[PDB]
């Protein structure tokens, strides 16, 4: 069911996480963590402690698709282990240092034409897919993106719950 989805939602906060490439994400979900730049992982920060649950929905650049959702667990955190990232072009390890936890609540995928009818008040309304890595999704626009999502079977929510 969506119920206990949905009580992880309750007054969350929502960031999209734009990533350059599949092989971070892929990272992502088997370790549980996530790095991004200083300028974001400020906000996070934040976010972390103004929230009950944090939500990063990612979507790797050019696939059309976002890849699953994922709950904040921790602020960011230095000299834990040294994640073995794939840099694009101009980024360093240095920048990706800073390394959050996160609960995944759903790996499944979700195409852009799914999300067509959600738009986002903190981006102009422009369409939920449109915007850069870091973005805020006002709240309304966040839970229904999530709820569009397929249900992941292979999570229990119990564990994410207990974490609040």
Same mark, same amino acid.
């Given at each position: /069911? &969506?119920?206990?989805?949905?009580?992880?939602?309750?007054?969350?906060? @929502?960031?999209?996480?734009?990533?350059?490439?599949?092989?971070?994400?892929?990272?992502?979900?088997?370790?549980?963590?996530?790095? &991004?730049?200083?300028?974001?992982?400020?906000?996070?920060?934040?976010?972390?402690?103004?929230?009950?649950?944090?939500?990063?929905?990612?979507?790797?650049?050019?696939?059309?698709?976002?890849?699953?959702?994922?709950?904040?667990?921790?602020?960011?955190?230095? /000299?834990?282990?040294?994640?073995?990232?794939?840099?694009?072009?101009?980024?360093?390890?240095?920048?990706? /240092?800073?390394? @959050?936890?996160?609960?995944?609540?759903?790996?499944?995928?979700?195409?852009?034409?799914?999300?067509?009818?959600?738009?986002?008040?903190?981006?102009?309304?422009?369409?939920?897919?449109?915007?850069?890595? /870091?973005?805020?999704?006002?709240? #309304?626009?966040? &839970?229904?993106?999530?709820?569009?999502?397929?249900?992941? #079977?292979?999570?229990?929510?119990?564990?994410?719950?207990?974490?609040?």
């Amino acid at each position: /069911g &969506t119920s206990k989805l949905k009580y992880v939602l309750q007054d969350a906060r @929502f960031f999209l996480i734009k990533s350059n490439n599949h092989e971070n994400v892929s990272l992502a979900k088997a370790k549980g963590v996530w790095s &991004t730049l200083p300028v974001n992982e400020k906000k996070l920060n934040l976010a972390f402690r103004s929230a009950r649950s944090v939500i990063l929905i990612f979507s790797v650049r050019e696939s059309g698709k976002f890849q699953g959702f994922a709950r904040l667990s921790s602020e960011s955190h230095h /000299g834990g282990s040294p994640i073995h990232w794939v840099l694009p072009a101009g980024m360093s390890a240095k920048m990706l /240092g800073g390394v @959050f936890k996160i609960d995944w609540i759903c790996r499944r995928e979700l195409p852009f034409t799914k999300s067509a009818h959600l738009t986002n008040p903190w981006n102009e309304h422009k369409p939920v897919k449109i915007g850069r890595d /870091g973005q805020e999704i006002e709240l #309304e626009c966040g &839970t229904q993106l999530c709820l569009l999502f397929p249900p992941d #079977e292979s999570i229990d929510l119990y564990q994410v719950i207990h974490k609040m």
